[model samples]
Target chain A: AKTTQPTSMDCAEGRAANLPCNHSTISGNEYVYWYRQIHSQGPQYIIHGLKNNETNEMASLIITEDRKSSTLILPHATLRDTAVYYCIVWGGYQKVTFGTGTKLQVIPIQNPDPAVYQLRDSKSSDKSVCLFTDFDSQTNVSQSKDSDVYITDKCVLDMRSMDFKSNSAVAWSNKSDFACANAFNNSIIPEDTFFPSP
Target chain B: TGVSQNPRHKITKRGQNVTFRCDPISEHNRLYWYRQTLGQGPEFLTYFQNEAQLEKSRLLSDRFSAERPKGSFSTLEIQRTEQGDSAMYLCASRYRDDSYNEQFFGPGTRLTVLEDLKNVFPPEVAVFEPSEAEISHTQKATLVCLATGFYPDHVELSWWVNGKEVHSGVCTDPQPLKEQPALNDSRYALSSRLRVSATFWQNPRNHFRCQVQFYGLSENDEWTQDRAKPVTQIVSAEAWGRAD
Candidate 1:
C-alpha cells in the first residue's frame, strides 16, 4: 500500500533544507524530492534530475506547491549546513518479502481469534477447540479425553484477510486424505486470513 | 433481683487476714493457680499443671534471670512481716490455659500491693443467673407476670385490656432457654416460656388478654401456643387457678 502525507517541504537547491510530513492518512504516494540550502560545495556532484528540471547549480523540480507537494530553490553557495535531505518510500512487499527473507524474529501473536479446528462432531461433548495462542509453529490441535486430535505442519494456502476455514475438512494427512504428500486439508483455518494472490 | 450464680475472688490481706473460696467449684482439689492484677494481665503458673501439687509453690526460670520482656508481671505482698522473712507472690506467666488457668475473679475485690496474691485469672465467659422472685396478691388485685424459656436475654411480655397493651411496674426479664443445634450453621433454635398469671383482681369479672412477643426469629418461625384465647370474666379474688 502507498501512503502520502498532507504537508510540504521547505528548502532550496544548494542550501541546507528541512521537510516535515503529517501522515494522518497516507495513500500510497512513494516518490520524494531533494534540494540543498546552499550551493558551490560539490553542487555538481549532487544528483540532478528531480523530475527533469536542472541547472549547473540548481534544479527546476516541479512540485505541485501544496497539492501532493515538494520544494526547490537555488542556494547562494555551499556551507557545512548546506546539505540536502530526501525521503523516499520502499519495500512493503519488500518488508514482507525480506521479512520472510531473513530468519528474523516475528511475534505471530499479532492476531488471534481464528485458526484450526477439531475434527469430531460438534455435538461431541468433549469437542472443544480454542487457540491457546497464535503462532506459526504452535500446534493447533491438542488431544484430550473423549477424543483424539492432531495438527499438520503445512501452512494454509491462498490465505488472506484472516479467514481460515471451509465447509468441511479436506483430509487428515496428505497421502491417506487428499492423496498428496502435504496436506492442510484445504479447510480454511478460521483464524488465518485468506487473500487472493495478486 | 440479684445474680443467681455468683463467682467469688478473695485477696488474703497480709496482716488483716483473708480467705478465698469458689462456691461453684464445690471445693474440688483441681486447684489451678495463675496471676492477674490490674494494669497487668494474668501470668501462668509453672507449678500448676494438670493435677500438679505444690508446697509453697515458687518456681523460677532461666528466662526470668534475663528479665524477660514477654508479658506484664507484678509482685504481691502480705504486709507487716519482716521484709525478707515474709513470702511474696511472684507472677509465673500468662494465665491463659483453658484447662487450668482460665479462672474467675471476684467482682468486689481489687488487687492491691498489700494482699497475698492467692489467685490469678484469665478472661472467661462466666455462667450466672440473677435472683428472681414474684409475689401475687389476689386481695390487692395485683397481677405479677414472669415466664422462662424465651431468648435474646431481654424481652417484652404484656397484658392487654381490649386491644391496648398494658405494662406492669415490675421489671420484665425473658431469659433465653438452653440452646440446641440448629438445622444449619448461622442458625439456632430455642424453646422458652413466658410468665403471665392473674394474681389478684378486685373486679374478678374483668376480661384480660395475655400475649407473648418475640422478635428476630427466622421467617419460618412459628409458635405452638395454647390458652391464647382471651380471658373472659376475671374470676373472683377467692377463686384461684395456678399454672407454674
Candidate 2:
C-alpha cells in the first residue's frame, strides 16, 4: 500500500522556515517520516526518505544520521503555506503519546494610549487602570490635569476590596525585553511527599 | 486579594512629594514596582524582597526611591516631582520559593504632572516587498507594506494606488513585533506589516505607496515644525517582475 499527498499547497513569504521532530526511541533501520494535514480533510504524505539525510524541491530533510531527531526546512514560507505539519517514524511501531491536552496563550502587549495604563487579568474580572494628579515643580501643591480624574470608572475585579486567591507580579524594563517582575503563588503544595524507597 | 495597592490615585505637582504603597499576600517576600507611561509598556523601576532590593533599572536615580519599611509593606516615593514624573505607578507581590509563581497585578495609581504630555516618535523606515509566490507571478501579485522603528505603539498605515486610497485586500499584522529597547532614549521600536493583492500591478499606470502616520518632527521641517506628520514610501510596477 502507498500513501497519497496532494500536489497543491499554500505558503507565506520572506519567512525562513524550519520544522523539527523528536524520536528518542527508534530502531536503527527505521526511516523518519514527514506528513501534512490537507486542510483538516485528511492526512497526506509529503516526503519520506530520511535515515541520515534527504532533499527535494519543496523542502530539505536533514537527519542527525544519529536517527534521534530530524528537521524539515522550507527555504521561504508564505500565507499559502500555512498547514498542520506532522512527523512519524516508519519501519517500526510508532510510539504515540496520548494525554491530557495542554494549551498556551500569547498575552498582548500593554496599551499604547498616552492617556491610560491598563493591567490585564490572568483569567478574568480583575482588569486595572489607575490615574494620578499632575504637579508643578515651581509650586508646592498638587493640581488636577482635568475634570476626568479616573480614566476607567469601575474595575471588574477590585483588588482593593476583594481577597485574591493568588499573588503574582510582572515587571519589565523600558530598555529591554527582559521580564523584571516575579510572581509568587501558593497553589502548589510542598514537594516533601513521602514515597517508598526503591 | 493576594496583593493590593493603596491610594489607587495620586495627585502630585512638579517639585512636590508623593508616596505609593503596595500590600502583598501574607508570607510573600517578593514585591515589584513599575512606572508605565501612557501608550508605552511598563518600565521596571525596582523590586524588593528577601531582605534586600533585587533589581533596579538604570532609569531610576536620586529622583526616585523605593523602600520596604518594617519589611511588611513597600513604598515608592518621588521627591521633588518634575513635569515628566506624571504616570501610572503599579505594584505587585509574590512568594519566594521553589513552587510555581505568577505575578498578580494590582490596580495602578495614576499620577499626572501639570506639564505637556509626551509627544510620539515616528517610524524611521518604510518599504514594500512582494510575497514569494507573487515574485514568480506576473498576471497577479501580493504586496507587503512594512514599517519599522517607531514609538507610542500606535500608528496609521495606508496604501495608495496611483494616488487613490485603497481599502480592499489590505490587512495589518495580527500582532506587533516589539523591537529591543535602545540605550538611554527609552523610545520603543515596533514594526507592522500590511498585505495587498490586486491585478493593478499589471498596469504600468498604477503606482503603489505606503504611508506611516506618527507624531514627530519631519526632516525637512527639522526644528521648524513642532508637530508630527505623515511620512510615505512609494513603489511602482517597475520594481516588481513583469506585470503584463
Candidate 3:
C-alpha cells in the first residue's frame, strides 16, 4: 500500500526566495513536495513523491498563488539544512527522502532529561532497532525472540518486526541476536549476557 | 500592524559618541548592542543599566550606561576615550516580555580600533526573499529569510497562504549544525513566503505571503510582523518554447 506525505515551500526561483517551514500537525492524507533554485535563476521545480510500505523516496510540491512564498526554505542556515522533505504516514515504519534544497536546522528541545539510547537500522537486512530501557508497547514495535539487547535503562528491541509494522513491505522479523549493521555491537555493553560465546 | 523602519545615516567620527534613539515605549523590545572588534568576532553583553545620579532604580547590572532620555532615545555611552571602543557599535531594540524577545543589532558603525583592527560591526540580520517570477502549476515554490545567524537551540517554521495558514507535515532534524555560543547580537532578519502547487483549478496567481517570527524583539518579548505582504502572479508550468 502507499501513503501520501507532503512538504511545501513558500517561493523559489528568481534571485532569492523566502521559505517558511514547519513539521508536526500533519495528518495521513497529504503528499510531500519539493521546490528549489540555482542562484540568479528562477525556481527550478524539483519533484513530488509520496510515502509507501516499501519506504522509498518521493516528492510533492505546493505552489502558492504567488511563486514567492514557499513552505520550505532554510535561510542563512548551513548548506546541510537545505535538503527539504516532509512526512505523512500516520502509522507504521517509514523513511523520507529530502532534496538538496531543504535546508533545516536541527534544534534541541528542552528535553527535561537527556535521552540515553541509540537508534540503529540495517539497510541490508532491512532491519532497525532502538537501544532503550523501556519498550513503548503502545507503539507496536517488538524485539527479536533470542536476541538479548540492552538499553540504557530498558530493553532494546528490533525496529523491524511484525509487531510494530501494521503492513510489512518486506517481511522484516525481529533479531535480538542479529546486529542491525552499524547500529550496535557486543562491545557496546561491558558484558554480553544473552548471546554468549557466539 | 506597524513596523519601525530603521533610518539610514552615518555616524560622524571615529570614537565619537553615537546614541541610538528608539521611540514608542511599552514596545516590549529587548535592546541589544554588539561590537565587532577587529579580526575577532562580535563581542556582546546583556547591557547593564547605569544611573545618572550616582545610582539606579531599575537595579540590574552596572557595567554600561543607559537611560530612557525622555522616552525617545535610549543612550548607551562610554566614558572618556579608548582605542578599543572604535568598533562598529550596533544595537537591537528587541521587543519585550515574550519568550523569544531579543535585541536585533542594526547595521554596524564601521569602527577603527586605533592601531588594532581595521573595520568592525555587530552581528546583523540579513532578511531576503526571491523575486517574483514565471512558474508552472505542478511545481513547488519557495522563499528564504535569514537572521544574521543565531545558534538557536530551537527553531519554529510555518507557512501562510493569502494570509491563511497551511499545514506542512512534520519537520524534524538532528542537531548542533553549527557551533553555537551562549549570547549573540549581530544581524537578524526574517523572510516570509507563501506556496501552492499547479493544477488548473489551483492557479499561482492567488494572494499569498510567508512570515517569520522570532522569540525576542518586542516589549512583549515577541517579534511578529504580518506587515509586508507581497503579490503573486500566475505562469505556465510547461518549459517547451524558446529562451535564446
Interface RMSD of each: 46.0, 25.2, 24.4
RMSD of each: 43.9, 26.2, 23.5
In candidate 2 the C-alpha lDDT for residue B147 amounts to 48
- Which parts of model 3 are misplaced by more than 4 Å? A1-198, B1-26, B38-41, B48-64, B70-72, B100-104, B113-244
- Sorting all predicted structures by TM-score, with the top scorer first, yields 2, 3, 1
Q: On a 0 to 100 scale, what is the lDDT of residue A133 in model 2?
A: 10
DockQ of all candidate complexes: 0.00, 0.02, 0.02
* Highest TM-score model number: 2
TM-scores, all candidates, are 0.15, 0.29, 0.24
What DockQ would candidate 2 receive versus the native complex?
Answer: 0.02
In the range B2-67, model 3's lDDT, one tens digit per residue, is 222132222222344444333332453334344544223234432322211223324223434556
Model 2: residues >4 Å from true position, as ranges?
A1-198, B116-244
Task: Decide which is better by lDDT, 1 or 2.
Answer: 2
- Candidate 3's DockQ is 0.02
Write the number of the candidate with greater TM-score, choosing between 1 and 2. Answer: 2
The Cα local distance difference test for each model comes to: 0.25, 0.44, 0.28
Q: What is the lDDT of residue B114 in candidate 2?
A: 36
